[PDB]
């Protein structure tokens, strides 16, 4: 009954800020601004943030603090018919650690590779290089940059793989890096939040030291201002386009990461009367703020490339891992004191990742430890078995075709599943549990009910929000493709099973928990729609 | 436009039980916590019980827990306070106050209902007219009185000439002395208007079905 | 339980002057949760100040609030007669919710001697076994009056009911009733009944009296 609590209030805020400030704060937001009308993109971004993202961010934090249990225990206590939401969501974050962790290992592999005087991705005259290597980025696909060839042909060895069927040799230098990542995640997550809330002081604050000196370094190169122009010069024609509204909606939802049961988990350890509303507004601003700061860090360097290095802007203004692993390191290698900037850049990448992966793992631990007392007792043993499974199957992403394994999980394992889970999460709290019961819960904690704005957003805007994102995400679906390679038809189907394995437990647990409860039909529904609190 | 009206409330023997009701109006009752604040006869305010908007969160005073039950009828818009095992320390006026936001206090208060816990019995008063002394005619303004002695419980209403003598009248609060109240009122008026015109004190005590007029006559 | 006590308990100021009153908590209260209530005589409380400083709907601007931790205060810039009331502070941060001891604000006024009227027992009370002599002491200031009953010259100290009125809202004055109760056998066995009032406005007491013959 007596639940642990944060050693300090900063432990909670830094570990929430940590979970929310990840890699997509640096490798997508700045791109979407350059792509969708510069500073004008801040309007649909800010609106979807205000009506879509923030209301869902606030809702899960208050749910966790109020119900004081992990993901699967809490959703059963809110609407027993929808107890499957907890299982789907703990499975989604279970799959997420089968691939997302490799990006932290990539950053660490580049970190250990940076312990030199001439960074190895500069020139085109190496073993791994091809005749079609060129110094910097181009727009012709057959002719790659030196940093692109270094990543694909030395770090990844992706060229030695003929697709998903051919993973090939296991690259043991990266199995080592993934192990260092999982070891770091362990001795920070095994003693619970007493140690977790302290490790997150380094990992959640270091990106701000790294952003600060890279912002200074970045803003003092020739052509630095030209980059800020591409970043922000407004073109309000974008606002009218329905894509950029769905681009803003999608980015705001993903960057806050609500509904995975990890914000819920962190908040479950709060004191019942903590001002969760204040906390939600503060940490969420710090998240979107960091993305704005980061865009200057990235595009100051981008304009320096275009000005003094002679590259077309659209050839280097990219998103995803391509930006942080080939484009930005290519610019670093041209500036004075290059190996210093690479070191703190890749450490920024890794410390940006550990934070958010702490949350996804904690969501699993807290949800299981709060439903199965067997697990709650033997935790540090249980998370060793968790991270040992993570490492073993993780070896698939350390093989030569390991990027093909990564790409498949990235577009199936969790993307569509989490949108469905959170869609049912919105309807559970607002339409079955009721905004009445929820707003009254918030009043008991923080002293006042949430205004009707938050109530209309939870009840009406958020379902439409999540559908808007999902519809435009399905309109853009095509069978899986990476570069010239097209995935076999069986690999596409297997991706849908991973997407369905989680979501299927909304109705599976429903019909099971429905059939196994006594009474007539209406009796069964009201039994499984009366919350746990209303029965105690 | 918000109105809170407290109902119920009266005289109870110790150990007895009574239910108080507050009829709310002028706002959506269903989204506002409500509380019962009581005020002792020594005028000190004491919070009793808070019930949340949906009735799912309830808090009680220690002085009162175990014996009182607070509840809402959010359909009919009535607040209730079931009381039991009453002791004399529960004697107070009971207020129905709306307080949903803790950071803003109690927006509105009802006008109160009065509970008395005693083992003393109801007693109608003796209303005595108080006429001036005989040798006192040598004066400019004359002062009349009316003595309401030995009644229980409160309240009593005292008016003069059915309420048309509002000026120059002092009606003193009642004092409890050994299980009975005594109250008195004085009205002063010009010598021309009395005994020429008529002055009478009208006393009502609904607890004992007493309506009594006593007219002031010289001696 | 968080005990809030206020000072002064009763307080007289003349209209126009500044009025400051304090509310102290046995244990600290957050600024968001301390409120103030005004209650005029015979009426319900009205929310007056919420969250330390914020005036409620209809509260005139001469009112203000300040404080933090365990020390808060209400201040009337220039007081008015309509501000005469009793002010209660209240904390809303911890259950049980507690109200303050209260501060009665009363109006200062020129001194004024009472008007004393003596009243013998009525014809009706004497038919039953009782006799009550009533002394009215009307329209004086300040509030402290001191009655004294004498029966044929000797001070009589038991069987008395004193009642004070609230401060009159017209002339800011006080009145007081005093009733001495005897048996008819007791009353009809003495001659002179005197009622002496001792007030600040005079060293010598004001004396009204009657003899049983008339
Ligand atoms: C570009 C970087 C530097 C910052 C991005 C801007 C956002 C952090 C700002 C801009 C719009 C703001 C939102 C716009 C509207 C409001 C409504 C406001 O809601 C209410 O007052 C609710 C009514 C009630 O409580 O009764 C609360 C803050 C919020 C969500 C704001 C929170 C912070 C937002 C998202
Ligand atoms: C926290 C504990 C620290 C050490 C323990 C774990 C570190 C894991 C890093 C993986 O090791 C990689 O193996 C390559 C095998 O050689 C290294 O050399 C490669 O990189 C050098 C770059 O100068 C070249 O000179 C070498 O020839 C080339 O082989 C490469 O750098 C290194 O990253
Ligand atoms: C790179 C430059 C432009 C940005 C610098 C921003 C830094 C200094 C800001 C960004 C996030 C801020 C943190 C946000 C959260 C809190 C919680 C608060 O209770 C203690 C301070 C603390 C920990 C802040 C410290 C200062 C901070 C780290
Ligand atoms: O790196 C980053 O920016 C961070 C941003 C904050 C959240 N974390 C991990 C949560 C990952 C989610 C997610 C969870 C809940 C809601 C929305 C998204 C996810 C889902 C599908 C695919 C990939 C990731 C990634
Ligand atoms: O950039 C890349 O190569 C990959 C690298 C790893 C992370 N993945 C995120 C995929 C998830 C998205 C999404 C991101 C960008 C565009 C479209 C969709 C999402 C967003 C919101 C909700 C659910 C899923 C993008
Ligand atoms: Cl963002
Ligand atoms: Na983010
Ligand atoms: Na992070």
PDB file of N, CA, C and O in Angstrom, chain B residues 5-65:
ATOM      1  N   UNK B   5     -30.693  27.354   0.454  1.00  0.00           N
ATOM      2  CA  UNK B   5     -31.714  27.441   1.493  1.00  0.00           C
ATOM      3  C   UNK B   5     -31.623  26.197   2.364  1.00  0.00           C
ATOM      4  O   UNK B   5     -31.827  25.078   1.878  1.00  0.00           O
ATOM      5  N   UNK B   6     -31.328  26.390   3.645  1.00  0.00           N
ATOM      6  CA  UNK B   6     -31.229  25.284   4.587  1.00  0.00           C
ATOM      7  C   UNK B   6     -32.596  24.971   5.181  1.00  0.00           C
ATOM      8  O   UNK B   6     -33.339  25.874   5.573  1.00  0.00           O
ATOM      9  N   UNK B   7     -32.920  23.686   5.242  1.00  0.00           N
ATOM     10  CA  UNK B   7     -34.187  23.199   5.765  1.00  0.00           C
ATOM     11  C   UNK B   7     -33.923  22.290   6.960  1.00  0.00           C
ATOM     12  O   UNK B   7     -32.777  22.070   7.360  1.00  0.00           O
ATOM     13  N   UNK B   8     -35.000  21.743   7.520  1.00  0.00           N
ATOM     14  CA  UNK B   8     -34.857  20.912   8.699  1.00  0.00           C
ATOM     15  C   UNK B   8     -34.484  21.752   9.909  1.00  0.00           C
ATOM     16  O   UNK B   8     -34.780  22.947   9.988  1.00  0.00           O
ATOM     17  N   UNK B   9     -33.822  21.116  10.871  1.00  0.00           N
ATOM     18  CA  UNK B   9     -33.288  21.846  12.004  1.00  0.00           C
ATOM     19  C   UNK B   9     -34.315  22.236  13.045  1.00  0.00           C
ATOM     20  O   UNK B   9     -35.346  22.834  12.723  1.00  0.00           O
ATOM     21  N   UNK B  10     -34.035  21.910  14.304  1.00  0.00           N
ATOM     22  CA  UNK B  10     -34.938  22.223  15.396  1.00  0.00           C
ATOM     23  C   UNK B  10     -34.382  21.836  16.752  1.00  0.00           C
ATOM     24  O   UNK B  10     -33.175  21.960  16.988  1.00  0.00           O
ATOM     25  N   UNK B  11     -35.243  21.363  17.649  1.00  0.00           N
ATOM     26  CA  UNK B  11     -34.848  20.967  18.995  1.00  0.00           C
ATOM     27  C   UNK B  11     -34.856  19.447  19.105  1.00  0.00           C
ATOM     28  O   UNK B  11     -35.835  18.798  18.717  1.00  0.00           O
ATOM     29  N   UNK B  12     -33.766  18.884  19.628  1.00  0.00           N
ATOM     30  CA  UNK B  12     -33.566  17.440  19.705  1.00  0.00           C
ATOM     31  C   UNK B  12     -33.066  17.084  21.098  1.00  0.00           C
ATOM     32  O   UNK B  12     -32.288  17.834  21.697  1.00  0.00           O
ATOM     33  N   UNK B  13     -33.511  15.939  21.611  1.00  0.00           N
ATOM     34  CA  UNK B  13     -32.950  15.413  22.844  1.00  0.00           C
ATOM     35  C   UNK B  13     -31.550  14.859  22.587  1.00  0.00           C
ATOM     36  O   UNK B  13     -31.249  14.403  21.480  1.00  0.00           O
ATOM     37  N   UNK B  14     -30.666  14.906  23.585  1.00  0.00           N
ATOM     38  CA  UNK B  14     -29.343  14.296  23.418  1.00  0.00           C
ATOM     39  C   UNK B  14     -29.461  12.817  23.071  1.00  0.00           C
ATOM     40  O   UNK B  14     -30.307  12.097  23.608  1.00  0.00           O
ATOM     41  N   UNK B  15     -28.603  12.372  22.154  1.00  0.00           N
ATOM     42  CA  UNK B  15     -28.684  11.045  21.597  1.00  0.00           C
ATOM     43  C   UNK B  15     -29.577  10.929  20.382  1.00  0.00           C
ATOM     44  O   UNK B  15     -29.415   9.987  19.596  1.00  0.00           O
ATOM     45  N   UNK B  16     -30.496  11.870  20.193  1.00  0.00           N
ATOM     46  CA  UNK B  16     -31.413  11.833  19.078  1.00  0.00           C
ATOM     47  C   UNK B  16     -30.723  12.061  17.745  1.00  0.00           C
ATOM     48  O   UNK B  16     -29.503  12.181  17.641  1.00  0.00           O
ATOM     49  N   UNK B  17     -31.547  12.136  16.698  1.00  0.00           N
ATOM     50  CA  UNK B  17     -31.064  12.198  15.328  1.00  0.00           C
ATOM     51  C   UNK B  17     -31.945  13.127  14.508  1.00  0.00           C
ATOM     52  O   UNK B  17     -33.167  13.134  14.669  1.00  0.00           O
ATOM     53  N   UNK B  18     -31.313  13.915  13.635  1.00  0.00           N
ATOM     54  CA  UNK B  18     -32.022  14.821  12.742  1.00  0.00           C
ATOM     55  C   UNK B  18     -31.273  14.899  11.418  1.00  0.00           C
ATOM     56  O   UNK B  18     -30.050  14.738  11.369  1.00  0.00           O
ATOM     57  N   UNK B  19     -32.020  15.146  10.344  1.00  0.00           N
ATOM     58  CA  UNK B  19     -31.465  15.325   9.007  1.00  0.00           C
ATOM     59  C   UNK B  19     -31.700  16.760   8.547  1.00  0.00           C
ATOM     60  O   UNK B  19     -32.843  17.232   8.525  1.00  0.00           O
ATOM     61  N   UNK B  20     -30.622  17.441   8.170  1.00  0.00           N
ATOM     62  CA  UNK B  20     -30.689  18.782   7.610  1.00  0.00           C
ATOM     63  C   UNK B  20     -30.609  18.712   6.091  1.00  0.00           C
ATOM     64  O   UNK B  20     -29.965  17.823   5.528  1.00  0.00           O
ATOM     65  N   UNK B  21     -31.269  19.657   5.427  1.00  0.00           N
ATOM     66  CA  UNK B  21     -31.303  19.695   3.974  1.00  0.00           C
ATOM     67  C   UNK B  21     -31.016  21.104   3.482  1.00  0.00           C
ATOM     68  O   UNK B  21     -31.455  22.084   4.089  1.00  0.00           O
ATOM     69  N   UNK B  22     -30.270  21.201   2.383  1.00  0.00           N
ATOM     70  CA  UNK B  22     -29.986  22.469   1.724  1.00  0.00           C
ATOM     71  C   UNK B  22     -30.455  22.385   0.280  1.00  0.00           C
ATOM     72  O   UNK B  22     -29.943  21.571  -0.494  1.00  0.00           O
ATOM     73  N   UNK B  23     -31.423  23.222  -0.081  1.00  0.00           N
ATOM     74  CA  UNK B  23     -31.967  23.243  -1.435  1.00  0.00           C
ATOM     75  C   UNK B  23     -31.204  24.274  -2.260  1.00  0.00           C
ATOM     76  O   UNK B  23     -31.386  25.483  -2.078  1.00  0.00           O
ATOM     77  N   UNK B  24     -30.355  23.800  -3.165  1.00  0.00           N
ATOM     78  CA  UNK B  24     -29.558  24.679  -4.008  1.00  0.00           C
ATOM     79  C   UNK B  24     -30.328  25.068  -5.264  1.00  0.00           C
ATOM     80  O   UNK B  24     -31.212  24.344  -5.730  1.00  0.00           O
ATOM     81  N   UNK B  25     -29.970  26.225  -5.814  1.00  0.00           N
ATOM     82  CA  UNK B  25     -30.656  26.792  -6.965  1.00  0.00           C
ATOM     83  C   UNK B  25     -29.800  27.904  -7.548  1.00  0.00           C
ATOM     84  O   UNK B  25     -29.076  28.588  -6.821  1.00  0.00           O
ATOM     85  N   UNK B  26     -29.895  28.077  -8.864  1.00  0.00           N
ATOM     86  CA  UNK B  26     -29.185  29.139  -9.545  1.00  0.00           C
ATOM     87  C   UNK B  26     -27.853  28.751 -10.146  1.00  0.00           C
ATOM     88  O   UNK B  26     -27.152  29.624 -10.673  1.00  0.00           O
ATOM     89  N   UNK B  27     -27.481  27.475 -10.084  1.00  0.00           N
ATOM     90  CA  UNK B  27     -26.226  27.001 -10.649  1.00  0.00           C
ATOM     91  C   UNK B  27     -26.327  25.494 -10.813  1.00  0.00           C
ATOM     92  O   UNK B  27     -27.159  24.840 -10.179  1.00  0.00           O
ATOM     93  N   UNK B  28     -25.480  24.948 -11.682  1.00  0.00           N
ATOM     94  CA  UNK B  28     -25.449  23.501 -11.872  1.00  0.00           C
ATOM     95  C   UNK B  28     -24.804  22.871 -10.643  1.00  0.00           C
ATOM     96  O   UNK B  28     -23.579  22.818 -10.516  1.00  0.00           O
ATOM     97  N   UNK B  29     -25.659  22.397  -9.730  1.00  0.00           N
ATOM     98  CA  UNK B  29     -25.243  21.786  -8.470  1.00  0.00           C
ATOM     99  C   UNK B  29     -24.209  20.684  -8.661  1.00  0.00           C
ATOM    100  O   UNK B  29     -23.383  20.444  -7.772  1.00  0.00           O
ATOM    101  N   UNK B  30     -24.227  20.014  -9.814  1.00  0.00           N
ATOM    102  CA  UNK B  30     -23.489  18.775 -10.018  1.00  0.00           C
ATOM    103  C   UNK B  30     -21.990  18.967 -10.212  1.00  0.00           C
ATOM    104  O   UNK B  30     -21.261  17.970 -10.251  1.00  0.00           O
ATOM    105  N   UNK B  31     -21.504  20.203 -10.338  1.00  0.00           N
ATOM    106  CA  UNK B  31     -20.085  20.450 -10.565  1.00  0.00           C
ATOM    107  C   UNK B  31     -19.480  21.323  -9.471  1.00  0.00           C
ATOM    108  O   UNK B  31     -18.508  22.046  -9.709  1.00  0.00           O
ATOM    109  N   UNK B  32     -20.036  21.257  -8.263  1.00  0.00           N
ATOM    110  CA  UNK B  32     -19.596  22.095  -7.153  1.00  0.00           C
ATOM    111  C   UNK B  32     -19.574  21.268  -5.880  1.00  0.00           C
ATOM    112  O   UNK B  32     -20.606  20.721  -5.477  1.00  0.00           O
ATOM    113  N   UNK B  33     -18.407  21.174  -5.249  1.00  0.00           N
ATOM    114  CA  UNK B  33     -18.326  20.542  -3.941  1.00  0.00           C
ATOM    115  C   UNK B  33     -19.225  21.398  -3.059  1.00  0.00           C
ATOM    116  O   UNK B  33     -19.514  22.555  -3.374  1.00  0.00           O
ATOM    117  N   UNK B  34     -19.678  20.820  -1.950  1.00  0.00           N
ATOM    118  CA  UNK B  34     -20.412  21.546  -0.928  1.00  0.00           C
ATOM    119  C   UNK B  34     -19.924  21.147   0.457  1.00  0.00           C
ATOM    120  O   UNK B  34     -19.450  20.025   0.669  1.00  0.00           O
ATOM    121  N   UNK B  35     -20.050  22.077   1.401  1.00  0.00           N
ATOM    122  CA  UNK B  35     -19.663  21.841   2.782  1.00  0.00           C
ATOM    123  C   UNK B  35     -20.744  22.343   3.726  1.00  0.00           C
ATOM    124  O   UNK B  35     -21.597  23.155   3.362  1.00  0.00           O
ATOM    125  N   UNK B  36     -20.696  21.836   4.954  1.00  0.00           N
ATOM    126  CA  UNK B  36     -21.539  22.302   6.047  1.00  0.00           C
ATOM    127  C   UNK B  36     -20.642  22.969   7.081  1.00  0.00           C
ATOM    128  O   UNK B  36     -19.772  22.315   7.662  1.00  0.00           O
ATOM    129  N   UNK B  37     -20.839  24.265   7.294  1.00  0.00           N
ATOM    130  CA  UNK B  37     -20.140  25.008   8.335  1.00  0.00           C
ATOM    131  C   UNK B  37     -21.149  25.342   9.423  1.00  0.00           C
ATOM    132  O   UNK B  37     -22.235  25.856   9.131  1.00  0.00           O
ATOM    133  N   UNK B  38     -20.805  25.041  10.670  1.00  0.00           N
ATOM    134  CA  UNK B  38     -21.678  25.353  11.789  1.00  0.00           C
ATOM    135  C   UNK B  38     -21.066  26.460  12.638  1.00  0.00           C
ATOM    136  O   UNK B  38     -19.843  26.584  12.742  1.00  0.00           O
ATOM    137  N   UNK B  39     -21.936  27.273  13.230  1.00  0.00           N
ATOM    138  CA  UNK B  39     -21.536  28.376  14.096  1.00  0.00           C
ATOM    139  C   UNK B  39     -22.170  28.181  15.466  1.00  0.00           C
ATOM    140  O   UNK B  39     -23.399  28.219  15.592  1.00  0.00           O
ATOM    141  N   UNK B  40     -21.331  27.985  16.488  1.00  0.00           N
ATOM    142  CA  UNK B  40     -21.772  27.781  17.864  1.00  0.00           C
ATOM    143  C   UNK B  40     -22.509  29.018  18.371  1.00  0.00           C
ATOM    144  O   UNK B  40     -22.417  30.088  17.754  1.00  0.00           O
ATOM    145  N   UNK B  41     -23.266  28.919  19.467  1.00  0.00           N
ATOM    146  CA  UNK B  41     -23.862  30.132  20.049  1.00  0.00           C
ATOM    147  C   UNK B  41     -22.833  31.136  20.542  1.00  0.00           C
ATOM    148  O   UNK B  41     -23.182  32.307  20.736  1.00  0.00           O
ATOM    149  N   UNK B  42     -21.581  30.723  20.754  1.00  0.00           N
ATOM    150  CA  UNK B  42     -20.503  31.649  21.068  1.00  0.00           C
ATOM    151  C   UNK B  42     -19.830  32.212  19.818  1.00  0.00           C
ATOM    152  O   UNK B  42     -18.732  32.778  19.916  1.00  0.00           O
ATOM    153  N   UNK B  43     -20.463  32.054  18.655  1.00  0.00           N
ATOM    154  CA  UNK B  43     -20.166  32.735  17.388  1.00  0.00           C
ATOM    155  C   UNK B  43     -18.932  32.215  16.660  1.00  0.00           C
ATOM    156  O   UNK B  43     -18.551  32.810  15.642  1.00  0.00           O
ATOM    157  N   UNK B  44     -18.297  31.137  17.114  1.00  0.00           N
ATOM    158  CA  UNK B  44     -17.100  30.640  16.448  1.00  0.00           C
ATOM    159  C   UNK B  44     -17.494  29.650  15.353  1.00  0.00           C
ATOM    160  O   UNK B  44     -18.366  28.798  15.558  1.00  0.00           O
ATOM    161  N   UNK B  45     -16.879  29.798  14.181  1.00  0.00           N
ATOM    162  CA  UNK B  45     -17.193  28.968  13.026  1.00  0.00           C
ATOM    163  C   UNK B  45     -16.360  27.696  13.041  1.00  0.00           C
ATOM    164  O   UNK B  45     -15.166  27.723  13.355  1.00  0.00           O
ATOM    165  N   UNK B  46     -16.997  26.581  12.693  1.00  0.00           N
ATOM    166  CA  UNK B  46     -16.327  25.287  12.651  1.00  0.00           C
ATOM    167  C   UNK B  46     -16.834  24.519  11.442  1.00  0.00           C
ATOM    168  O   UNK B  46     -18.039  24.278  11.317  1.00  0.00           O
ATOM    169  N   UNK B  47     -15.917  24.158  10.548  1.00  0.00           N
ATOM    170  CA  UNK B  47     -16.266  23.333   9.401  1.00  0.00           C
ATOM    171  C   UNK B  47     -16.600  21.919   9.866  1.00  0.00           C
ATOM    172  O   UNK B  47     -15.989  21.396  10.803  1.00  0.00           O
ATOM    173  N   UNK B  48     -17.583  21.301   9.214  1.00  0.00           N
ATOM    174  CA  UNK B  48     -18.145  20.028   9.654  1.00  0.00           C
ATOM    175  C   UNK B  48     -17.840  18.908   8.667  1.00  0.00           C
ATOM    176  O   UNK B  48     -17.311  17.862   9.048  1.00  0.00           O
ATOM    177  N   UNK B  49     -18.180  19.102   7.395  1.00  0.00           N
ATOM    178  CA  UNK B  49     -18.024  18.039   6.411  1.00  0.00           C
ATOM    179  C   UNK B  49     -18.065  18.631   5.011  1.00  0.00           C
ATOM    180  O   UNK B  49     -18.855  19.536   4.739  1.00  0.00           O
ATOM    181  N   UNK B  50     -17.215  18.107   4.133  1.00  0.00           N
ATOM    182  CA  UNK B  50     -17.213  18.464   2.723  1.00  0.00           C
ATOM    183  C   UNK B  50     -17.529  17.230   1.893  1.00  0.00           C
ATOM    184  O   UNK B  50     -16.988  16.148   2.147  1.00  0.00           O
ATOM    185  N   UNK B  51     -18.401  17.392   0.900  1.00  0.00           N
ATOM    186  CA  UNK B  51     -18.676  16.341  -0.068  1.00  0.00           C
ATOM    187  C   UNK B  51     -18.373  16.871  -1.464  1.00  0.00           C
ATOM    188  O   UNK B  51     -18.696  18.018  -1.795  1.00  0.00           O
ATOM    189  N   UNK B  52     -17.709  16.042  -2.266  1.00  0.00           N
ATOM    190  CA  UNK B  52     -17.243  16.465  -3.577  1.00  0.00           C
ATOM    191  C   UNK B  52     -18.425  16.610  -4.534  1.00  0.00           C
ATOM    192  O   UNK B  52     -19.579  16.335  -4.190  1.00  0.00           O
ATOM    193  N   UNK B  53     -18.127  17.061  -5.755  1.00  0.00           N
ATOM    194  CA  UNK B  53     -19.181  17.323  -6.731  1.00  0.00           C
ATOM    195  C   UNK B  53     -19.963  16.054  -7.052  1.00  0.00           C
ATOM    196  O   UNK B  53     -21.199  16.051  -7.033  1.00  0.00           O
ATOM    197  N   UNK B  54     -19.260  14.965  -7.341  1.00  0.00           N
ATOM    198  CA  UNK B  54     -19.889  13.695  -7.625  1.00  0.00           C
ATOM    199  C   UNK B  54     -20.125  12.816  -6.419  1.00  0.00           C
ATOM    200  O   UNK B  54     -20.562  11.671  -6.577  1.00  0.00           O
ATOM    201  N   UNK B  55     -19.846  13.312  -5.215  1.00  0.00           N
ATOM    202  CA  UNK B  55     -20.069  12.566  -3.996  1.00  0.00           C
ATOM    203  C   UNK B  55     -19.054  11.487  -3.698  1.00  0.00           C
ATOM    204  O   UNK B  55     -19.228  10.755  -2.716  1.00  0.00           O
ATOM    205  N   UNK B  56     -17.993  11.369  -4.501  1.00  0.00           N
ATOM    206  CA  UNK B  56     -17.013  10.302  -4.343  1.00  0.00           C
ATOM    207  C   UNK B  56     -15.889  10.641  -3.369  1.00  0.00           C
ATOM    208  O   UNK B  56     -15.143   9.738  -2.977  1.00  0.00           O
ATOM    209  N   UNK B  57     -15.747  11.902  -2.964  1.00  0.00           N
ATOM    210  CA  UNK B  57     -14.706  12.311  -2.028  1.00  0.00           C
ATOM    211  C   UNK B  57     -15.350  13.061  -0.872  1.00  0.00           C
ATOM    212  O   UNK B  57     -15.987  14.098  -1.080  1.00  0.00           O
ATOM    213  N   UNK B  58     -15.181  12.539   0.341  1.00  0.00           N
ATOM    214  CA  UNK B  58     -15.855  13.050   1.528  1.00  0.00           C
ATOM    215  C   UNK B  58     -14.828  13.255   2.634  1.00  0.00           C
ATOM    216  O   UNK B  58     -13.946  12.413   2.839  1.00  0.00           O
ATOM    217  N   UNK B  59     -14.945  14.374   3.349  1.00  0.00           N
ATOM    218  CA  UNK B  59     -14.086  14.682   4.484  1.00  0.00           C
ATOM    219  C   UNK B  59     -14.946  15.121   5.660  1.00  0.00           C
ATOM    220  O   UNK B  59     -15.970  15.785   5.474  1.00  0.00           O
ATOM    221  N   UNK B  60     -14.532  14.749   6.871  1.00  0.00           N
ATOM    222  CA  UNK B  60     -15.285  15.057   8.078  1.00  0.00           C
ATOM    223  C   UNK B  60     -14.393  15.725   9.114  1.00  0.00           C
ATOM    224  O   UNK B  60     -13.182  15.497   9.157  1.00  0.00           O
ATOM    225  N   UNK B  61     -15.015  16.547   9.954  1.00  0.00           N
ATOM    226  CA  UNK B  61     -14.362  17.020  11.163  1.00  0.00           C
ATOM    227  C   UNK B  61     -14.186  15.870  12.149  1.00  0.00           C
ATOM    228  O   UNK B  61     -15.014  14.957  12.223  1.00  0.00           O
ATOM    229  N   UNK B  62     -13.087  15.914  12.905  1.00  0.00           N
ATOM    230  CA  UNK B  62     -12.870  14.902  13.936  1.00  0.00           C
ATOM    231  C   UNK B  62     -13.939  14.987  15.016  1.00  0.00           C
ATOM    232  O   UNK B  62     -14.438  13.962  15.493  1.00  0.00           O
ATOM    233  N   UNK B  63     -14.310  16.211  15.402  1.00  0.00           N
ATOM    234  CA  UNK B  63     -15.360  16.435  16.388  1.00  0.00           C
ATOM    235  C   UNK B  63     -16.674  15.765  16.009  1.00  0.00           C
ATOM    236  O   UNK B  63     -17.547  15.598  16.869  1.00  0.00           O
ATOM    237  N   UNK B  64     -16.824  15.368  14.747  1.00  0.00           N
ATOM    238  CA  UNK B  64     -18.119  15.003  14.179  1.00  0.00           C
ATOM    239  C   UNK B  64     -18.111  13.656  13.465  1.00  0.00           C
ATOM    240  O   UNK B  64     -19.179  13.027  13.323  1.00  0.00           O
ATOM    241  N   UNK B  65     -16.954  13.144  13.048  1.00  0.00           N
ATOM    242  CA  UNK B  65     -16.884  11.891  12.303  1.00  0.00           C
ATOM    243  C   UNK B  65     -17.506  10.741  13.090  1.00  0.00           C
ATOM    244  O   UNK B  65     -17.524  10.738  14.324  1.00  0.00           O
TER     245      UNK B  65
END
